[PDB]
């Protein structure tokens, strides 16, 4: 429906607002800098501190992104209802190194 799409867009906007108020927040070498929405997508922008780690663990950042969002009760409900999360991770130079959609399908077996 148009009404279900409208509801998801309003949910994505509200949830981006809620999460924005607490920024920036660090989780080890990740610093969450910016949260936005677009349609039914919550966009999470983080700096991965390449300067501090001397590493670029792309595989690990992706696998831990999928598992952490999927295992969060609130995000998992949101995904199943039709919200999607877009995870953008930049290195210390601000260069984009990960740009990955997490959807309800991401959490399912395949």
């Amino acid at each position: 429906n148009g009404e279900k799409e409208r509801q998801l867009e309003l949910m994505a906007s509200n949830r981006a607002g809620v999460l924005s108020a607490g920024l920036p927040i660090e989780y080890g070498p990740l610093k969450v800098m910016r949260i936005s929405s677009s349609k039914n997508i919550v966009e999470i922008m983080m700096i991965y501190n390449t300067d501090a780690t001397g590493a670029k663990p792309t595989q690990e950042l992706l696998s831990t992104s999928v598992s952490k969002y999927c295992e969060d009760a609130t995000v998992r409900n949101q995904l199943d209802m039709g919200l999607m999360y877009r995870i953008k991770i930049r290195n210390s130079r601000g260069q984009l190194i990960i740009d990955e959609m997490v959807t309800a399908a991401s959490c399912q077996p395949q």
Copy 2:
């Protein structure tokens, strides 16, 4: 021409690359975090440290943006050739507070 547009797009991409290598760089309460390009536009993303200043001097940020880009010899040449700069400034929460194009016209009397 198609060739002049192609040249400006290649210039915007190269110049975004050059400036990215030095990031992040601070200019008082501004921290330049990310530089990108799109077509003939160099996009400059900065955090204005609202937490540290307790202020939101929107007028000042805009007037000093126009004057600083216009008065830079290299940027002024680039603007006159057809490159444009897009200045995006976020507060401490990552919320967008300025999104302003600077073009060759920005430097002229009116």
Copy 3:
């Protein structure tokens, strides 16, 4: 008295504790990183962001230190009772550039 010295030492320790809980806090190009006590002295350690300003305004940092502590109602009372503040400011390299006692006498005419 021994008892008045003991009271001032306990006050300096408690006040260092109170202020520590809120750190780090920025005031423009100053970042308060560490607060300690020693006897009747509250020690305030800040980084002055020499990298961001490209300046070392020693005179200004000293005059604004004396005036800001002297004009604060709580600090002014504390100073008059016999507490002292030691202001240590380091540059971006962590090198000590100011180490200045502020006492009750600092606020008086001379």
Copy 4:
């Protein structure tokens, strides 16, 4: 000798200077903020990012301090000659959580 003590004090001062020029530098959740000397001691002050980790791994910070300084060719030579390193680690609040001497004896079996 007085001359060997003087040589170690001059070495500690010079080495503190050398290391200061590169600050701040991050090694994962450690940020080296300040390096000083006192007599034959190089003092290393770091922030351990308790806010980002949600942990206080005191044992690990101490064991990895001893092993990293002992296993560094230059530091190991310096220690054997009579220089000592004092490792001070503060949490996110600037509160001192580790203050540990590393000496030539630290690297030996016992």
